[PDB]
Amino acid sequence: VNWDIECWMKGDLTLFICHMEPLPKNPFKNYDSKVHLLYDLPEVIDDSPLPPLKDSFQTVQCNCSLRGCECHVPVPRAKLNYALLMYLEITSAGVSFQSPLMSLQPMLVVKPDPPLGLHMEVTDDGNLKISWDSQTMAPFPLQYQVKYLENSTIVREAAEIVSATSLLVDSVLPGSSYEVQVRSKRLDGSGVWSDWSSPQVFTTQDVVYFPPKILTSVGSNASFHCIYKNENQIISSKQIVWWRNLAEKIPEIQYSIVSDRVSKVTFSNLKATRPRGKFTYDAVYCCNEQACHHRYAELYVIDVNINISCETDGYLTKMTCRWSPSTIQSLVGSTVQLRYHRRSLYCPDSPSIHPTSEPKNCVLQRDGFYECVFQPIFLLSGYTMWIRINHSLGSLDSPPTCVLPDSVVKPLPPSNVKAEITVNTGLLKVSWEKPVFPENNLQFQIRYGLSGKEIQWKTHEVFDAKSKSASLLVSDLCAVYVVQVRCRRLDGLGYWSNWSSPAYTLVMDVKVPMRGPEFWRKMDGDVTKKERNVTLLWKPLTKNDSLCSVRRYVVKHRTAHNGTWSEDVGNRTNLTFLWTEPAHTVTVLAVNSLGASLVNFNLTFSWPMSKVSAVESLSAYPLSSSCVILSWTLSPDDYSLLYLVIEWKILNEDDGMKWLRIPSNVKKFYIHDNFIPIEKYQFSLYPVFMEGVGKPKIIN
Amino acid sequence: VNWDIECWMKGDLTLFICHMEPLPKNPFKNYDSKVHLLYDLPEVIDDSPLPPLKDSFQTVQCNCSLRGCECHVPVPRAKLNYALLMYLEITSAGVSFQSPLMSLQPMLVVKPDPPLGLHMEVTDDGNLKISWDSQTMAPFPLQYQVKYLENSTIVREAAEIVSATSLLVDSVLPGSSYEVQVRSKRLDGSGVWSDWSSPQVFTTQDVVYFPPKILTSVGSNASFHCIYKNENQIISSKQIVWWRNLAEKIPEIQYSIVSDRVSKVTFSNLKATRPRGKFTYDAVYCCNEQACHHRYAELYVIDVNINISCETDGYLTKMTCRWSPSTIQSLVGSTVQLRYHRRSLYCPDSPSIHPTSEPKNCVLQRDGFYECVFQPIFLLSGYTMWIRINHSLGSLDSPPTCVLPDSVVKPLPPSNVKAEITVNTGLLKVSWEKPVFPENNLQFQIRYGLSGKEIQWKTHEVFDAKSKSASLLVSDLCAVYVVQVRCRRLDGLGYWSNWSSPAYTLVMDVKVPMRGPEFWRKMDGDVTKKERNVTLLWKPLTKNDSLCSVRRYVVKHRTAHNGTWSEDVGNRTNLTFLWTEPAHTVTVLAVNSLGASLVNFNLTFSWPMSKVSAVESLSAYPLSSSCVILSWTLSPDDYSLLYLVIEWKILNEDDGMKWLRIPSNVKKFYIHDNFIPIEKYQFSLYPVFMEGVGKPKIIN
Amino acid sequence: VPIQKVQDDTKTLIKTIVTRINDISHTQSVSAKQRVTGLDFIPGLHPILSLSKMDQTLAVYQQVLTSLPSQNVLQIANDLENLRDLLHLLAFSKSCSLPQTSGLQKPESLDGVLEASLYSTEVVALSRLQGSLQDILQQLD
């Protein structure tokens, strides 16, 4: 019985396989031939010619089939270099056949697995690059035989031996198909050739763009190449005219001739691709002059300049980082991830995209931005930031940005801001409470303005980080002021605090009235009657005389008998009192919360002095319905006239009373008031003295 | 052959166990000895010396092992006190050995099970209590043997026999360990001692608190205890200083000494506890003066209080009890439940947490209140209710509260609320339909106000539970009023019903317009023609004159020949009619829905006295651009003038005629109008008589 | 980098953490005189002088508070890792080439007290580190 025996070590270096084929065919059709393999793996190479003991060989029962017997001998990887003692025991029809002892080394006879990953590509020069993946577990170099067949108009078959994992085929023929097969073999020793790998077929097109796509950025450069074939002829690169979106012939200055068949266009300083309806890419066309083939090259230019803004809370608890994806929606499908590395140190002068970055989770809001809260935060640690725009055509990284939390702290508005006008100085003094913050190095900004529908805000800055209150100069001492304060870092870092709550001062009389009201009298009582009611008549003080307010009017009376006594009139502007003494001195006082008016008017009533006349003439000259001149002459007697008081009223009218005190030096006056010529008027001139009001002068 | 036999009744009183051990060891190593227990349980104690029949004994096959044979005799609990007649049959090596008959009562020989629930606790005197359970299933007294192993600074093991289920152990040693074991035996009879139980260990600290943890309420009284061990020395109670949170030292007035080794602190009138940052209670400290142990006694104090708003619907089918969990939110893990007990009688003056209380499901609404809805209800039953909050550290109850369903009824709103104006009286009559309610004891409330953007609501109460309508005084009889009627129980119990539908008053003419309009006449036609167009000129009635409205004007005329006729003039305020008769008078009526105006003026046109001039002179004195004086003299003739009519206009302006009726007694008049001096004004004074209009006096 | 800004940075950040601890420990006003047993593995009854000794004290500080389970504490831990690195840098800026050896601690008694008295442990931790940084800021001048 004859056997054709082939033995090889399995590609995994774990099993030694012996395949056996009986010779010749079918003299054995009804016998159970049991083939037993006995193998030995000695562990010590001892130079002693001692025969191996018969109990040392391990017996392997081989799998025998109708086509042959396969023997599976487990060879340890550590013993792949050892001498494998081998012999066979074949028993058939009661007869046992023993083969002579065989010695072999499993490592020398290895059949590797077929090469995998047979990729196919076109180089920028227009060459046809075959590539495949080497077996990473082979402890020996592998020699590869590559069989590629060119399915062009002429069928070309080539089988090439290579030690590398790639092969190059020259002159890519456009519109041609290439199928490649690669098999491996150990370079050194009697290695057994691996079976051919799966054939990889690559069919070229009439126009070949390589790279057919470029995902690039704004300002970046993209280079596209072409092998243009018209019908059966390859268009020369000199004849290749490039077009972008078929609406812009790329200038021939941008044409670079890689070869007589390869024309190259290189875009430089690329602008972000405007979305062309459903096109988010710039279509780059290889054209034989004007004959633009229906296929093009895709150019993707994205704007990776996204600003990310970060803020630190006043409780110093969290960072709030935000940014907007506005430059990202141009490309549908791009997945953007902020990648952060927190450098333990402060941020570098040049923030760098750190290889050890961590994924960060951020939320798109209703405002269109993405917030990124960092917690816990590290004060002196450099937080290197950048977005990773993972597009299907490649991942794009925003320029790395690093943030130190201190310079992005927005302050808390100070608490309990108080606004008030200091008394007797009128200084609006404002006090506020400093919120909790490091170093208290806070530059405070206040804003103040009058209370109303529209507050004309006035601001002031506080550079002293120690100040807690300040007094301010305001225009109206009796109008309500609204005050708000905001604070920031004195160094200018961080942010400004929100403006504080509106602080309202309380209106109070900062000082007493400054002048008493002008008061005249309505003279009630018969002349024959010694008692005569004197109806004092004054007017409320102005905002300047009252400053803020007059809470009451006090009329102080003085007599020789009753001495001096004062009568509070309160808010009333008139006072009727009886005249009983020859001299009765009257003074009306305007009183506010701080007291009476300092300087007050006085008026004396005297029976003897009421008879004295200092005026001899008085004349009413009507200038118009809005003015009349009163002209009068005063006595040559040295009358110490305080002032003259002009009395004018409508005759027959007891309520057309009007009066006016004028200086005693006046001889002619202009009464500007609505004047009706129809009615008769009583113009009265009153000489007023120390002793009282002298006898007046009246003209009708 | 000799055998050792032990028999006892099992603790469950279901199996009688006879344990057996052969004597001596192993003369029988290869024989299958069959041991049988033949037993009898006679049912009648008859005093007849009749030997038991051999067929009455029941046979049980014993389970024999290499260590001995165990025979299990099932004894009914009803026959435990009966005499158990039994004998043993042992078959070994073909030889049968029969034991003499033995009589015993299984109740007198029972081996109890070991006690369970072994616990060690410290009394407030510092004394340890070793506690365990008594076996309830045992119908017989037990005596327990307690072996303790004090593993203190001095190791003290002592075995003590007690009949109670707890052991007094004095003066717990701080910083020490203890091992205790207990076994039991029947107190009466030949009790077989139980096996020793599992040793329960209770180890001490150099400082021991008792009771270490307190859950309590606001205002209550409590007490902690301590035993301080300084190193190997137990600190005296006279020397233990107590501390709370180590920030407040407890006054020694609140200390107390139980024993010199045992310190105790006492507190009274607790208040609610404030969380300390995250820490939420008060930490009591036992300190050797200033030597504070790292261990502590913990105090929980909570404010016990919870209300609940129950309301009975107007249809009297349900309560809705609602309450806030706002005060429960402090202790995490606290679980709340409304526990109610219903009472067949009315609510007691003091609601009490009744032992028979049921749980109520309550739904938290979006408002933050728990909603407890009860259905079906009985209005006269007192529902005693309280909130049970089950914190992890105990169960506590809100103050119990009782609610009467009839006492929380909200009646349905009054219906058919109708707002109408009573005619000829001007009274706001509001009629409505009463809601369904028992006893009709309802008090109704009516609110009304002007219909507009702001309804100045005016309220009026209807105490009469029988009243279905009410009348209200109003001042404007021609305006729309919004009226609503709400009700509540007449006794005031329960709630108010919600306000009814807004009842809107309709505007109708309550009365005819109170006067007819004043009209003048415009002469369209020369003097020469006997026929003259009398263009009457009047004005619409004001609010008072029209009252509510003037639906139309109708001008009535009279003549000597044609009698009296009327012209429906409608809304227009002028009437041009031809004058043809010697005596012709005109009257205009203001007609509303109820009829024509009551008071109406007259103006007769008469040819003969159209020549009669009752005005001697007439003059115009312009006081201002806004005023002109008219003065006139009448003829000294006894002219029975009804009134005077002043007609003035700008000359050359035929559309600027203005007229006014004035009483005939007036001699000087003041006309207020925008008088432009450059324009010349025609002032005409018409004398008016009963029988016609006199000849006017006209000035330009 | 200039060292004056580093020094000012140290002073500012330490006083910021002072504010942090101060207002966190608001519901935790302390009486510094009481010694409770079992936190001896916290020194601080002593002035701190040398860069090595303060450095190691701080390292132990970190290590002991690692057992502390909180979040405000975690932010403070970030703060102290920053401060530890910067004190390495300041020791370097001293131009003293003393080798920077570290570690050498045993986390057993710490964990026993941790499983014992988290309350006292955290409060004494905050308070004693307060005093520690107080003496440190005294010593920086």
Author numbering:
A (entry chain B), B (entry chain A): 125 to 824
C (entry chain C): 1 to 141
Article excerpt on this structure:
To stabilize the leptin–LepR complex, we engineered a construct comprising the complete extracellular domain (D1–D7) of LepR with the transmembrane (TM) domains replaced by dimerizing leucine zippers (LepRD1–D7-zip), thereby enhancing the avidity of LepR for leptin. Recombinantly expressed mouse LepRD1–D7-zip formed a stable complex with mouse leptin in vitro as assessed by co-elution over size-exclusion chromatography. Analysis of this complex using single particle cryo-electron microscopy (cryo-EM) yielded a 3D reconstruction of the leptin–LepRD1-D7 complex to 5.9 Å resolution. Above the leptin-binding regions, the membrane distal CHR1 (D1 and D2 domains) bend upwards, resulting in a highly elongated structure with a total estimated length of approximately 180 Å projecting from the cell surface. Below the leptin-binding interface, the two-membrane proximal fibronectin domains (FNIII, D6 and D7) of LepR bend inwards towards one another, forming an approximately 90o angle between D6 and D7 which is predicted to bring to TM domains of each LepR monomer into proximity. Notably, there is no direct interaction between the two LepR ECDs, suggesting that receptor dimerization is primarily ligand-dependent, as has been observed for other class 1 cytokine receptors. The asymmetric conformation observed in our structure suggests that a single leptin molecule is sufficient to dimerize two LepR chains and activate downstream STAT3 signaling.
